[PDB]
Homo-oligomer: A and B are copies of this chain.
Amino acid sequence: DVQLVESGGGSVQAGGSLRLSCAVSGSTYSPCTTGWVRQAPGKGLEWVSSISSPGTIYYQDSVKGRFTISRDNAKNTVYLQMNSLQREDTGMYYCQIQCSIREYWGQGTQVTVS
């Protein structure tokens, strides 16, 4: 039932801006934690930022002050504002929701920083 659609990704001049969105459709039967994981070329997965059900934000020390995460509950959509894009920020970005520990993933969106 649950489905997470992502968008907003693309190529950027190193230092530019981007905003990714994670649309959520289906029955979650409860508010969830929504996080963002990214995977650099030929590398593992890494926790970027998260916003708990209650509304508590968290950021990978690495991206503080550059990445901003917001959630519009009405639209059931999570956003990730990416500014000050560095090359190290190149990779595939995935949103993941944790709502019984049921977990879901998006199909990723690509982000390459010149």
Contacts and interface: CB of A to CB of B under 8 A. Distances in A.
A100 B44 contact: no
A91 interface: no
A50 interface: yes
The A interface, classified by DSSP as helix, strand, loop or mixed, is: strand
A94 B58 contact: no
Contacts of A101: 33, 35, 50, 52, 56, 58, 98
Interface in A27-59: 33, 35, 37, 44-47, 50, 52, 56, 58
Interface residues of A, number: 23
B108 A45 contact: yes
Given A44-B107, A44-B108, A45-B108, A58 B98 contact: no
A44 B94 CA distance: 9
B100 A37 contact: no
Contacts of A105: 37, 44-47
A19 B110 CA distance: 32
